[PDB]
């Protein structure tokens, strides 16, 4: 079957910025792709809609996905609070890579990051499971709101999200 595509409509203090769409590599990372897909549609009764990109560090990545604590510490998967690292087949080769954030081995939840540069030192520690399809210019625009410690100068949110 074909890899699913999901979208985020990004807002800045509630004003639309643009749409980012992602190809999810279900063909190579099915369990991790399925988690992100289901969190994007909200079909389990919880997910990304309304949550924030809480940590944006220019030159590195935009990180979000905490819909449970809303403070960068939380999140949960469709499989429970955490799930194991599925594989490390794919690498952090450049801008647009979509990868799981974690707190060490086998702690995937819902937090994720979009690379804005090659982050090869994360290879083998974070599971890569997708890439930006359309809207990299939106991701680049989100960087304007980050800083060296990741704090954002305006609220960058996933105002809407779903499956295409």
């Amino acid at each position: 079957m074909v890899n699913p595509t999901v979208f985020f409509d990004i807002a800045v203090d509630g004003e639309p910025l643009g749409r980012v769409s992602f190809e999810l590599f279900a063909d190579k990372v099915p369990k991790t792709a399925e988690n992100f897909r289901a969190l994007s549609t909200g079909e389990k009764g919880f997910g990304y809609k309304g949550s924030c990109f809480h940590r944006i560090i220019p030159g590195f990545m935009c990180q979000g996905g905490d819909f449970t604590r809303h403070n960068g510490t939380g999140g949960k998967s469709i499989y429970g609070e955490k799930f194991e690292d599925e594989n490390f087949i794919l690498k952090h080769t450049g801008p647009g890579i979509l990868s799981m954030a974690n707190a060490g081995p086998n702690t995937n939840g819902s937090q994720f990051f979009i690379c804005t540069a090659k982050t090869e030192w994360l290879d083998g520690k974070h599971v890569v499971f997708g890439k930006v399809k359309e809207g990299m210019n939106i991701v680049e625009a989100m960087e304007r709101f980050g800083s060296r410690n990741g704090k954002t100068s305006k609220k960058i949110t996933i105002a809407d999200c779903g499956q295409l």
Binding site: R55, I57, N71, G72, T73, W121, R148, N149, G150
Partner: protein
């Protein structure tokens, strides 16, 4: 005239590096955890009758980025090595921080203070005696703190300043 001190706060994730620093700088505590990337603060204080400008680098409890962490250690003059009294792994982690600091600064005599934080909590796993003995083996002070109640907070940072001053004036 005043004197300036470059202090660096290190220790495992969640032990209270930021809560200690924020209590010193801003005189408040919050139970909400905001994981650190990197933050720096400046505050003027009086220590032993002398005016002191404290530069505090609050580091993250991660170990991955050795190039950056080594530069923190090269620039820093004194190190607050923090563990939590209810986190035995964090206490076991202490010797790694001391070894890294000695390696980077190429010295067996680096100003440092061992801090056992969260002493207000009822869930202690590390005995005070064990930490006292470790500090003695290193030749450095040991101070028990609580960022929540402010116990020992000034004492920990001011003792570190005194250790830098003694080292520089040897």
């Amino acid at each position: 005239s005043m004197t300036e001190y470059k202090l660096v706060v290190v220790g495992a994730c969640g032990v209270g590096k930021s809560a200690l620093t924020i209590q010193l700088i801003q005189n408040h505590f919050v139970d909400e955890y905001d994981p650190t990337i990197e933050d720096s603060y400046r505050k003027q204080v009086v220590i032993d009758g002398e005016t002191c400008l404290l530069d505090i680098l609050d580091t993250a409890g991660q170990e991955e980025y050795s190039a950056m962490r080594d530069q923190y250690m090269r620039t820093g003059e004194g190190f607050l090595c923090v563990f939590a009294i209810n986190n035995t792994k964090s206490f076991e982690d202490i010797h790694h921080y001391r070894e890294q600091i000695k390696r980077v600064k190429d010295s067996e005599d680096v100003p440092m203070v061992l801090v056992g934080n969260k002493c207000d909590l009822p869930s202690r796993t590390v005995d005070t005696k064990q930490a006292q003995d470790l500090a003695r083996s290193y030749g450095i002070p040991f101070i028990e703190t609580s960022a929540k109640t402010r116990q020992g907070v000034d004492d920990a940072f001011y003792t570190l300043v005194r250790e830098i001053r003694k080292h520089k004036e040897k």
